[PDB]
GROMACS .gro file of C-alpha atoms in nm:
model
   77
    1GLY     CA    1   0.000   0.000   0.000
    2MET     CA    2   0.089   0.369  -0.017
    3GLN     CA    3  -0.136   0.565   0.219
    4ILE     CA    4  -0.044   0.917   0.331
    5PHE     CA    5  -0.140   1.140   0.623
    6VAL     CA    6  -0.184   1.518   0.631
    7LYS     CA    7  -0.187   1.734   0.944
    8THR     CA    8  -0.353   2.075   0.968
    9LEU     CA    9  -0.322   2.370   1.206
   10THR     CA   10  -0.649   2.290   1.382
   11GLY     CA   11  -0.505   1.964   1.509
   12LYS     CA   12  -0.698   1.771   1.245
   13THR     CA   13  -0.548   1.476   1.057
   14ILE     CA   14  -0.669   1.349   0.719
   15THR     CA   15  -0.571   1.047   0.510
   16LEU     CA   16  -0.544   1.034   0.131
   17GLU     CA   17  -0.425   0.798  -0.142
   18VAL     CA   18  -0.210   0.877  -0.446
   19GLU     CA   19   0.073   0.754  -0.668
   20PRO     CA   20   0.446   0.836  -0.695
   21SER     CA   21   0.408   0.934  -1.061
   22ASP     CA   22   0.141   1.184  -0.957
   23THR     CA   23   0.219   1.554  -0.998
   24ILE     CA   24   0.115   1.835  -0.764
   25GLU     CA   25  -0.049   1.993  -1.069
   26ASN     CA   26  -0.255   1.685  -1.154
   27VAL     CA   27  -0.342   1.593  -0.795
   28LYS     CA   28  -0.494   1.941  -0.770
   29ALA     CA   29  -0.762   1.845  -1.022
   30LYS     CA   30  -0.880   1.564  -0.795
   31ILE     CA   31  -0.916   1.806  -0.504
   32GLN     CA   32  -1.105   2.062  -0.713
   33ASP     CA   33  -1.335   1.790  -0.847
   34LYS     CA   34  -1.413   1.699  -0.486
   35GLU     CA   35  -1.424   2.038  -0.314
   36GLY     CA   36  -1.326   2.283  -0.586
   37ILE     CA   37  -1.095   2.474  -0.354
   38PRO     CA   38  -0.837   2.666  -0.561
   39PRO     CA   39  -0.483   2.644  -0.419
   40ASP     CA   40  -0.455   3.021  -0.453
   41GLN     CA   41  -0.469   3.094  -0.080
   42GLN     CA   42  -0.335   2.755   0.029
   43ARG     CA   43   0.037   2.700   0.080
   44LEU     CA   44   0.173   2.347   0.123
   45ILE     CA   45   0.496   2.314   0.321
   46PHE     CA   46   0.707   2.008   0.403
   47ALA     CA   47   1.056   1.956   0.543
   48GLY     CA   48   1.087   2.334   0.557
   49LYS     CA   49   1.056   2.343   0.179
   50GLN     CA   50   0.757   2.497   0.000
   51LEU     CA   51   0.590   2.254  -0.241
   52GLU     CA   52   0.655   2.391  -0.589
   53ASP     CA   53   0.419   2.331  -0.882
   54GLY     CA   54   0.720   2.182  -1.057
   55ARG     CA   55   0.761   1.919  -0.787
   56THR     CA   56   0.639   1.559  -0.814
   57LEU     CA   57   0.524   1.309  -0.553
   58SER     CA   58   0.810   1.066  -0.620
   59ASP     CA   59   1.043   1.358  -0.692
   60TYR     CA   60   0.998   1.465  -0.330
   61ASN     CA   61   1.097   1.117  -0.214
   62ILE     CA   62   0.783   1.109   0.001
   63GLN     CA   63   0.778   0.766   0.165
   64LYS     CA   64   0.469   0.591   0.302
   65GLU     CA   65   0.314   0.724   0.622
   66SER     CA   66   0.449   1.073   0.552
   67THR     CA   67   0.309   1.375   0.735
   68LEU     CA   68   0.263   1.708   0.557
   69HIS     CA   69   0.167   2.043   0.709
   70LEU     CA   70  -0.143   2.228   0.590
   71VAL     CA   71  -0.170   2.607   0.615
   72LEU     CA   72  -0.497   2.800   0.639
   73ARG     CA   73  -0.607   3.125   0.475
   74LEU     CA   74  -0.745   3.394   0.705
   75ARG     CA   75  -0.996   3.653   0.585
   76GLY     CA   76  -0.965   4.002   0.732
   77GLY     CA   77  -0.653   4.175   0.857
   0.00000   0.00000   0.00000
């Protein structure tokens, strides 16, 4: 298997499934087709490095059971 885990700032943890040949650009389509939330105000960070659109799942050497941080977008300030 190849299950992954994502942690948020609200102390919430979610699990998702994907492939190593999957690209951050393609994986986005799946999220939009489910929620439709545009990654315009969302910033993904991992290992102190900001996930670039030119980065791939396997290219990041993300092993199984990996934990990624999820930032939130505040409105008003």
